[PDB]
Write an enzyme that holds these catalytic residues in place. Structure first.
Site, PDB file in Angstrom:
ATOM      1  N   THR A 178      -5.947   3.535  -4.359  1.00  0.00           N
ATOM      2  CA  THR A 178      -4.702   2.982  -3.833  1.00  0.00           C
ATOM      3  C   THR A 178      -4.356   1.654  -4.493  1.00  0.00           C
ATOM      4  OG1 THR A 178      -5.889   1.928  -2.005  1.00  0.00           O
ATOM      5  CG2 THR A 178      -5.032   4.151  -1.640  1.00  0.00           C
ATOM      6  N   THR A 179      -5.357   0.949  -5.020  1.00  0.00           N
ATOM      7  CA  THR A 179      -5.106  -0.322  -5.690  1.00  0.00           C
ATOM      8  C   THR A 179      -4.548  -0.113  -7.093  1.00  0.00           C
ATOM      9  OG1 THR A 179      -6.847  -1.419  -4.412  1.00  0.00           O
ATOM     10  CG2 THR A 179      -6.154  -2.464  -6.467  1.00  0.00           C
ATOM     11  N   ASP A 204     -11.459   0.610   2.971  1.00  0.00           N
ATOM     12  CA  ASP A 204     -11.561   0.968   1.562  1.00  0.00           C
ATOM     13  C   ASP A 204     -12.766   0.308   0.902  1.00  0.00           C
ATOM     14  OD1 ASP A 204      -9.343   2.560   1.787  1.00  0.00           O
ATOM     15  OD2 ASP A 204      -7.952   1.100   0.920  1.00  0.00           O
ATOM     16  N   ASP A 264       0.847  -1.186   0.000  1.00  0.00           N
ATOM     17  CA  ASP A 264       0.000   0.000   0.000  1.00  0.00           C
ATOM     18  C   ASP A 264       0.886   1.241   0.000  1.00  0.00           C
ATOM     19  OD1 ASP A 264      -1.975   1.885   0.191  1.00  0.00           O
ATOM     20  OD2 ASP A 264      -2.696   1.271   2.170  1.00  0.00           O
TER      21      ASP A 264
END
Lengths: 508, 528, 487, 515
Positions: C76-77, C353, C43
């Site tokens: 974020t992915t 998330d 991450d």
């Protein structure tokens, strides 16, 4: 204690020549302090002047000396085997196996490799001098050195060069055809082969014959100041006695009509007055002409190599069919063609730059030697790593066939089988494909060939990353290529395996 | 100490001021771009405004601090368009070195510039624009499109043109003995992350950003005659005496008696009737629960500077402590004001109380939403500067065409003015006229165009205007287009700048170059 | 070009750091912090905040990822690379065309409008309440972590959370997710994870004689021998079964409060007292004498004991709310017992998330092809309008089409496939058959995203790309950088 | 990927740390710090604490042992051993071009297939019958992996009889029920004696304290007992009033003690305080036959409730007969400067106290670490009735099913097969380490095991073949008695898979921060 020192340090030596293997491989730049730029896949140059770190590279560089007189191409297998062998020490020997236990398994596998070597080879007929087989072998041989542009040009050149050397006994000697011209002219693809002899010098005077048919080749304290001029007058008579005798002796056959070609070749300097006296008889002379190249003239016109000017006989002067002279740069070349029975040929290489000739000079010297082993030994082995993959599977499953000491030899047997599999994986890695998927397809082709009750040899196509046939593609290796390599493959392996301990000491 | 005399001081001063000037010249015009400064302390600000940059930049030679104070004076006068102002006086030092090498006395260089600017006042009055002049629909929108230049916000001009104009219409107040003017700096600008500039909200009044402390308190107050009370009194456990200090039950009774009075102090606010109460310092849940039963909207963690504008606009008396003429603690009803409409609206995942219709002092707040903080850093200072241009526009209707129209025009007036004075000052006028033309030439440098091709054509159009007094129009024309590289009247393009901004720009630039020309030598004493 | 090189090379090395953070094949990178420890994670939100770079121009982009997480809450992915990916294709511009970035601003605005139209072309509605597609939709965003083993169980906690603690005020799902607490217990398995209606605490009991169990709890959130005893009598006047204070607990208060049959806790942070006050209904008490009957507990079913082999923890059993609606503030928690700290920290990032992604799912019920199919679908029309444009702006406009093709290319390099023939087939298939064709997350095949079961919301595609394009203009609008200012 | 091999090579040297500490025939490694603490043990938690490390990857190895300390606590060496074999296979198969996650995904499939065969390999046993033969064999294998054979024969009946005290029909095992271990320096460490009752760690500090008593009455205190003008007359009254606070409590002790029976003070009575004791109280305690203490602990007082039903009182306000307990026989021993009290002849003690005597600190540190690690390992055996044959029989047997799969479990061709052959050969390093620690040839022993398994599998007979390290030959874990708990091996394989994915999925090493 120190046994693991030489195993870990020398392990990083495989990456040196790792990417230099295969026709689809890449090149490495090597520049010395003298300004010589050598760009090639050849291992003799890369292992000579290059500085080494680990002392174990000394025996590796000296191991290629036997490959220079035999193969000279694909010598990276020497380094690729040592690198995989040292990684096996971190696996099998790390378990506590004595270094000699695995060593004995390789010596036994050496005799087993020779037994399977005669079954994998294919015999050909060299007595008929078939060019169709020579065009395919020289093709793939040049693919591992230069591109396809120089391959198509040099394929008929090397094929027609080895045909001039032959006899009823099939005697071919590399010491016969040696001299190869190296010059920068036109482009590398413009290299032209000459069936006759090529001279590196030509007429230096406008009156010298440009083109002729027959050519006669002749191979070669004072008290006052006034008394000092007497020695200068006597020294001029020394060279004059050599020139005046030539004018009378060349009159033997025809001296009156200068309608034929005339040749005089000398090793050292000559009185420039020769150009004036020879212009009347239309006689050609040379300036700073070599010597060893004169021994080949006896094999065409039946002449005789002569040193001094005292002994001159009609046997020295031969009869040539046609003589041509080409002007290139500051050095004219005299071409001898239309020969009755030429016993040798001269290789004329044309190129652009120095590094452009470095790739060709390494290809011609390694190309003529590889074809030499083809005519000497009629047995020709399929290439493209077909034997390394097949032999790995033959020794992988043995059991009651060849076993030996139980558990001591079997550990070394699996190491020798997995070590040979690095070479085909290296061929795929240099091409940019996945060696796991390519090898899986090659193993299926060999299994389908053995289960079909038919003897077949499957190769590896690096273009599409699939299997192919070395016979149809044309990839072929001589029997002496793998004979000295596999025999040397055991010697290079036993060097580090039988090595015990290296101590740091010496005389400062 | 270290003292050097001669031209070495004036040479090192001009080269130092020119080096730092060429850095801020890349922001000139609509095609200018922002730059980043590395403070080495961890803080950085990306902006084209020279007022902050010259203040942050470390001045090496002490002569460079004169131009730094010049940018501070522009803030007190105009404050907007600093990219087109402070770089004008920087070009006067470059051509001054050639005059110092000559026999012209430094005061003659000064005197030549004094008579140049004094006469240039009438030159501006010739091209001067009246209050009506061009079409001028609202006369603000035409200027609002000009304020979008010099900045990177020009792409949003379809919005900001309506934003600044419609917001400042309610700022008009009567002050300074019956003078009608806009109280600049009383406008509060708010920032919000997300979406784009089209989500901004116009508040005809004061808007404070804050929420209620307890979620159970009513967040909605509607209707008229909404009274607000600003209380800065800190509610906390009282400290001890001067250090003389003093049954723990009677000791705990100190907090019981104090907190009991604190609850009674809030009950006095209940009898006042104010809908919104403010508290500066934080409190516990004991005093917060009393605000819930008080049926009055409270706020904690309040900034003192935010409440000072509340008492000014609304008119209520700010109470820092509850006291009267007697010894009784209470809150009188005469400390509360009145407003036309007060309502709290939810904006950008938050809420803010909108105070509108302030009788005592009228003002307006602009609540804008944008990408993020770094994207709104330029949009913040730019909108704060644009408030002065709109002020100077309706305060004095005199404006001038921008984009190099003034600098190209003044050259023609000074050509006939140079031969008028003559003598030794004629060369000073020629160098002063050529120095004003450098600014429009550097305008096309940032646009990667050819300035000399435009200046030669633009000046020829201004010349045909002055050469013919009686003039229909076969000659007169003006304006310069950066995008198309053509000459077109700015009435269609809509670029006009106030005259008071350009007059004070050249007025302050006169004494800026003189301060450098009056320096004979520079000495530095080593610190202790 | 003096100051332009420092701005280009600032974010150039950032792309290689986060290149392994995208896709289900995403990998990790070991980083050595200045504190002396180590941070190993896939991450980048925690990496970009704690990373120290020499160029401050790159520090401005480190906060762009935090801004996208506060405003949107996703990216974020995948999109985390898109923030720094735009500047990759902008390098052959200043060194080649030598044109001011202003032209790119007009080129990105025209490309942004065309990108929104392509997403709307492939946009399809989907039911947010139906758990059919929502089950695979939640697992699509979190399927890039170690949770793949428990993703079947992890999806059950995320699916039931968005339908319980969210509710609504009417405007969408709007609510605050920060008040929702997720307890992370290391060791063991997640099979014991349940949805609990009350607060758990990790602090032990101060007295050995106090027995731990409760039927109907009463929660109180807070010479010397007799004074504290009288203070305990004021606390026990309402007969509370539980006493919680933020400060320490003296040994004298252990014996006095023992006569009331209550449990006493210590070292409780104010963050827990704020949640206990809302869940248990009690009011936080500052002055001890202020305790009254209004602090009695509300809607707490049962109290149990959950203890690790080391010390004792506070555990409150499940309950319900009698009805016999107000979704602005909800009181509830999800107990999570993690196996190891590596996967436990990932689930907390996934669950927060997943509720953030599922939020945007219910904000914009429309749905778009995910897994890398949309980026290649836009590049088909984005490059088509470039050939139709045929102008000066074509060069910066067509260069954006490379940025759309490099987003799935990052997944290809992480998976190990051949991007040459794969991307060449995607561009030919999208321009002919349909835009639903995409890259498989494992085999990397031409299988469509419809049958493969991966999708992404339209608001995730529109807002993330629009923010990344507007944020990429930051360094494009910086013409110079000055070092050594010394404020 | 130039930095990929950096973390792989640096972490390879972490295997040799605990390599010699694995197995019953393993050896010891000495670690001594500068504070004067000499710790000689096979436990990895102590060796990885104060030892300075170079590669940061060793921190994740210590975090993997956190879950192993709660579930197992002993035999955690196999965690790093499976990583060391993986690191040697790391640069091997990854160099072939296989993506690291592909090998990681192969471990997830192999882990699921291992749990399927895990239930077939284990042998379910009944813990209700309380079989002594099964407990003596399991405890014997655990003691040899920590201490030598001298302490193994002594501690074998000690650990066996200790776990039999804590049990019920519901299989309720409380690890906090029996905890306290007595640390004393007396005689030799091999003289450690097991006690089924409760032992007190303090004794009388005064010569007049009771030497031998029968029925003891324990009075437990916590709060500190020690207590700390116009004319000099006030100075004499303040100092005299300092003793009035203690004397006021002494008058209550005299009357409340004689309350029940005051005729014969021939029984025991004990007052226990946490802080220092007032010397003025010793005069009253001597004539009243009261035992007193100085600087006594606290947590040891809670054990009186689990045996005799005692109560630990804090203040002096509450005094009840429930606080005063009873004892059948009391034997007080004087060792050093602190006398020691033994409570024996208990009615039905539910907790056993471990009395460990020894020479010096490092002599006690070996046994103290062995009992805590050996008791928690056997305590988990009684929790789950499923028992797995030990001695590395599962690691070798599971590999046989993994090496031959083909149409059973295949998946991708060469992508999954690479991870299958890797994990199958990664479990064979444990039996090679067990033999290497004994000094024999691991391959010659493994060759005889493979030949024995081939003869047992072809004969169609169910048999478990182990490795006997004493004679260097094969054996049967059932005959020798080596067994393993179900939760020990299940969480070891699952725990090794989770920690393996951390190093394999690390793409590159990055250095960022302020110097």
């Amino acid at each position: 204690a120190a046994l693991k020192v030489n195993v870990t340090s020398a392990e990083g030596l495989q990456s040196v020549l790792e990417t230099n293997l295969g026709p689809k491989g890449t090149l490495k730049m090597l520049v010395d302090g003298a300004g010589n730029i050598k760009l090639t896949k050849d291992g003799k140059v890369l292992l000579t002047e290059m500085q080494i770190q680990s002392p174990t590279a000394v025996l590796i560089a000296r191991a290629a000396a036997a490959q220079d007189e035999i193969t000279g191409d694909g010598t990276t297998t020497v380094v690729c085997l040592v690198g995989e062998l040292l990684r096996q020490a971190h696996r099998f020997i790390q378990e506590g196996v004595h270094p000699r236990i695995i060593t004995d398994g390789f010596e036994i596998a050496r005799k087993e490799s020779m037994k399977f070597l005669d079954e994998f080879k294919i015999s050909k007929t060299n007595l008929s001098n078939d060019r169709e087989f020579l065009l395919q072998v020289a093709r793939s041989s040049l693919l591992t050195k230069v591109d396809a542009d120089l391959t198509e040009v040099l394929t008929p050149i090397v094929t027609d060069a080895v045909l001039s050397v032959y006899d009823a006994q099939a005697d071919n000697l590399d010491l016969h055809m040696v001299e190869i011209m190296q010059m920068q002219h036109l482009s590398p693809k413009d290299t032209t082969f000459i069936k006759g002899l090529v001279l590196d010098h030509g007429g230096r005077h406008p009156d010298m014959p440009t083109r002729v048919k027959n050519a006669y080749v002749l191979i070669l304290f004072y008290s006052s100041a006034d008394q000092r001029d007497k020695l200068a007058a006597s020294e001029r008579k020394f060279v004059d006695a050599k020139l005046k005798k030539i004018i009378d002796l060349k009159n033997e056959v025809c001296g009156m009509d200068p309608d034929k070609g005339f040749v005089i070749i000398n090793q050292k300097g000559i009185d420039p007055m020769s150009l004036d006296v020879f212009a009347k008889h239309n006689i050609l002379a040379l300036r700073r002409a070599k010597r060893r190249n004169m021994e080949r003239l006896q094999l065409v016109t039946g002449g005789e190599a002569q040193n001094s000017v005292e002994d001159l006989s009609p046997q020295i002067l031969g009869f040539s069919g046609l003589v041509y002279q080409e002007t290139i740069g500051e050095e004219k070349f005299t071409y001898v063609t239309e020969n009755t029975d030429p016993k040798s040929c001269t290789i004329l290489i044309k190129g652009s730059t120095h590094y452009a000739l470095a790739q060709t000079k390494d290809a011609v010297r390694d190309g003529l030697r590889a074809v030499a082993n083809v005519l000497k030994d009629k047995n020709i082995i399929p290439g493209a790593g077909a034997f390394y993959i097949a032999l790995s599977r033959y020794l992988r499953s043995a059991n009651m066939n060849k076993l030996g000491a139980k558990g001591k030899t079997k550990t070394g047997i699996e190491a020798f089988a997995e070590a040979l599999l690095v070479i085909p994986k290296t061929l795929v890695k240099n091409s940019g494909f996945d060696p796991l998927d390519v090898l899986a397809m090659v193993e299926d082709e060999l299994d389908d060939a053995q289960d079909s009750d038919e003897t077949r040899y499957v190769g590896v196509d690096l273009n599409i990353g699939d299997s192919c046939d070395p016979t149809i593609e044309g990839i072929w290796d001589s029997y002496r290529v793998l004979r000295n390599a596999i025999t040397g493959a055991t010697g290079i392996a036993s060097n580090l395996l039988l090595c015990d301990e290296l101590l740091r000491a010496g005389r400062s | 100490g270290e003292k050097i005399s001669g031209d070495d001081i004036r040479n090192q001063n001009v080269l130092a001021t020119m080096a730092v000037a060429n850095v801020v010249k890349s922001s000139l015009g609509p095609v200018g771009l922002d730059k980043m400064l590395v403070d080495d302390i961890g803080d950085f600000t990306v902006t084209n405004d020279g007022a902050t940059i010259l203040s942050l930049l470390d001045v090496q030679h002490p002569a460079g601090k004169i131009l730094v104070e010049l940018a501070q004076q522009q803030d007190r006068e105009i404050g907007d368009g600093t990219t087109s102002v402070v770089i004008i006086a920087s070009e006067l030092l470059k051509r001054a070195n050639e005059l110092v090498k000559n026999k012209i006395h430094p005061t003659t260089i000064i005197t030549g510039f004094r008579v140049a600017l004094r006469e240039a006042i009438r030159f501006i009055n010739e091209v001067l624009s009246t209050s009506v002049d061009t079409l001028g629909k609202e006369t603000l929108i035409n200027i609002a499109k000009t304020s979008m230049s010099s900045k990177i916000i020009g792409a949003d001009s379809d919005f900001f043109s309506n934003m600044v104009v419609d917001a400042l219409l309610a700022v008009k107040t009567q002050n300074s003995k019956g003078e009608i003017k806009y109280p600049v700096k009383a406008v509060n600008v708010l920032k919000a992350h997300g979406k784009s500039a089209t989500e901004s909200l116009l508040v005809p009044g004061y808007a404070l950003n804050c929420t209620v402390a307890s979620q159970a308190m009513p967040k909605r107050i509607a209707g008229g005659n909404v009274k607000i009370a600003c209380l800065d009194l800190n509610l906390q456990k009282a400290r001890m005496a001067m250090g003389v200090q003093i049954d723990p039950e009677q000791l705990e009774q100190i907090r019981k008696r104090e907190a009991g009075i604190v609850l009674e102090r809030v009950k006095k606010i209940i009898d006042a009737g104010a809908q919104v109460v403010l508290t500066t310092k934080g409190i516990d849940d004991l005093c917060l629960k009393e605000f819930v039963e008080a049926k009055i909207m409270g706020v904690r963690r309040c900034k003192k500077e935010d409440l000072r504008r509340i008492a000014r606009a609304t008119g209520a008396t700010l109470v820092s402590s509850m006291s009267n003429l007697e010894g009784e603690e209470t809150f009188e009803s005469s400390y509360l004001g009145l407003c036309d409409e007060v309502v709290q609206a939810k904006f950008s995942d938050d809420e803010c109380i909108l105070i509108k219709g302030t009788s005592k002092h009228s003002s307006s707040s602009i609540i804008l939403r944008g990408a993020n903080d770094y994207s709104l850093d330029e949009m913040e200072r730019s909108l704060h500067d644009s408030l002065s241009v709109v002020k100077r526009t309706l305060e004095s209707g005199n404006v001038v065409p921008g984009g190099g129209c003034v600098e190209a025009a003044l050259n023609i007036y000074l050509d006939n003015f140079a031969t008028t004075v003559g003598s030794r000052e004629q060369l000073a006028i020629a160098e002063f006229a050529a120095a004003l033309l450098i600014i429009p030439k550097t305008l096309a440098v940032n646009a990667a165009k050819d300035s000399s091709e435009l200046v030669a054509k633009l000046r020829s159009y201004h010349a045909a205007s002055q050469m013919a007094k009686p003039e229909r129009r076969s000659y007169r024309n003006y304006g310069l287009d950066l995008i198309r590289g053509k000459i077109v009247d700015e009435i269609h393009a809509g670029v006009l700048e106030p005259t008071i901004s350009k007059v004070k720009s050249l007025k302050s630039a006169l004494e800026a170059c003189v301060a450098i020309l009056r320096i004979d030598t520079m000495i530095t004493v080593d610190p202790e | 070009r003096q100051a332009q090189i420092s701005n280009i090379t600032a974010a150039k090395a950032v792309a290689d750091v986060i290149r392994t953070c995208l896709g289900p094949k995403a990998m990790l990178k070991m980083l050595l912090d200045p504190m002396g420890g180590l941070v190993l994670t896939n991450d980048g939100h925690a990496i970009l905040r704690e990373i120290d770079v020499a160029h401050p121009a790159a520090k401005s982009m480190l906060e762009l990822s935090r801004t996208q997480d506060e405003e949107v809450g996703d990216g974020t992915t995948t999109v985390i690379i898109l923030a720094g990916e735009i500047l990759a294709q902008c390098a052959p511009y200043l060194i080649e065309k030598n044109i001011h970035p202003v032209i790119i601003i007009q080129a990105l605005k025209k490309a942004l409008t065309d990108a929104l139209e392509v997403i709307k072309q492939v946009s399809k509605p989907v039911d947010v309440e139906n758990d059919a597609a929502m089950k695979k939709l939640i697992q699509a965003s979190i399927g890039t972590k170690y949770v793949i083993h428990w993703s079947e169980k992890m999806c059950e906690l995320a699916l039931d959370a968005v339908k319980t603690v969210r509710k609504d005020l009417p405007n969408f799902e709007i609510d605050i997710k920060r008040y929702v607490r997720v307890e992370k217990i290391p060791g063991g398995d997640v099979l014991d994870s349940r949805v609990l209606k009350g607060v758990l605490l990790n602090k032990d009991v101060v007295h050995p004689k106090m027995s731990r169990h409760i039927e109907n709890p009463r929660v109180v959130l807070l010479i010397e021998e007799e004074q504290v005893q009288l203070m305990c009598e004021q606390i026990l006047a309402v007969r509370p079964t539980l006493v919680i204070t933020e400060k320490g607990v003296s040994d004298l208060a252990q014996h006095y409060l023992l006569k009331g049959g209550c449990s006493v806790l210590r070292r409780v942070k104010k963050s827990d007292n704020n949640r206990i006050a809302r869940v248990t209904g009690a009011t936080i008490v500052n002055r001890v004498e202020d305790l009254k009957e209004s602090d009695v507990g509300t809607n707490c079913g049962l109290f149990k004991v959950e203890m690790i082999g080391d010390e004792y923890f506070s555990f409150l059993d499940n309950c319900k709310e009698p009805l016999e609606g107000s979704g602005l503030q909800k009181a509830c928690t999800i107990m999570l017992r993690g196996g190891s700290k590596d996967i436990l920290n990932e689930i907390d990032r996934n669950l927060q998330d997943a509720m953030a992604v599922a939020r945007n799912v219910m904000l914009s019920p429309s749905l778009s092809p995910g897994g890398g199919a949309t980026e290649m679908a836009v590049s088909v029309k984005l490059a088509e309008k470039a050939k139709q444009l045929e102008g000066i702006q074509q060069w910066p406009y067509q260069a954006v089409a490379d940025a759309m093709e490099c987003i799935p290319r990052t997944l290809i390099q992480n998976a190990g496939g051949d991007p040459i023939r794969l991307l060449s087939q995607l561009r030919a298939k999208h321009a002919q058959g349909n835009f639903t064709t995409g890259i498989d997350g494992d085999k990397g095949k031409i299988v469509d995203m419809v049958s493969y079961g991966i999708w992404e919301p339209e608001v995730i595609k529109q807002q993330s790309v629009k923010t990344a394009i507007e944020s990429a203009c930051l360094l494009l609008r910086v013409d110079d950088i000055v070092s050594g200012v010394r404020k």
